[PDB]
Amino acid sequence: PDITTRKNVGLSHDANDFTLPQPLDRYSAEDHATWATLYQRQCKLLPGRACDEFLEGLERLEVDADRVPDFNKLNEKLMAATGWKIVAVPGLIPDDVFFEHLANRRFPVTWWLREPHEPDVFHDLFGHVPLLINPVFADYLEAYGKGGVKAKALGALPMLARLYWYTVEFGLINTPAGMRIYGAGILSSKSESIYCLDSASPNRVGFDLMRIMNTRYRIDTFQKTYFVIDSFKQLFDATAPDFAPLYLQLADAQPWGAGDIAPDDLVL
């Protein structure tokens, strides 16, 4: 039995949107201490690494440093800033429900936390949610959600997911102060936060819609390529055109491997 099944023994979910109210009972003191340790460790590590918008979202959303946050209390601030809410889910959900959530400004957050010794509540909430404070990033995510139906209609969801992976989960952003991180999967990771900026090993490549959507990724370890945007506005702009011809042109195409450099990459 996996972590999700194990964590969810005895609980339920809405039949339509796979949400539940956050099971606030069921958090044990060990959950709060684990949350606090993880939060603490990231907060000491992230200055001069996370983009400023991330660190600032933690503050403005008052993401508890010493316990798993109350989703509702967080939603009060999140709704007021950008019209988004978080919804508690049991873990991985059907993609149809996920896109529909994002299209509706609901951000699905796994309710449970890893054990001290899968996306969990730390990755989903610490990693993803602080950035929903940035209106352009907030709109990009909504646009992404809506983009689900066209990609589904075209059998191109894997191409859309690569885009999401390489921006929302593992995106880097170039600033006048140097490279910073906006990808949630990095930001909730001690070692990957270090690696993605410090190491000479991974490829660091200028964002390019078509290349990203034709690029495989790594699910069990650090990424081998990171894609770098100039701003949230550039990212929103570049992802505003009709994706339909892009999806069709890549239909019979062979994808770049997670570690490839493409002939026309802007490499760093």
Ligand SMILES: N[C@@H](Cc1ccccc1)C(=O)O
């Ligand atoms: N422009 C995309 C929608 C989208 C926007 C932003 C992110 C992902 C997808 C389309 O034509 O389908």
Ligand SMILES: [Fe+3]
């Ligand atoms: Fe994530």
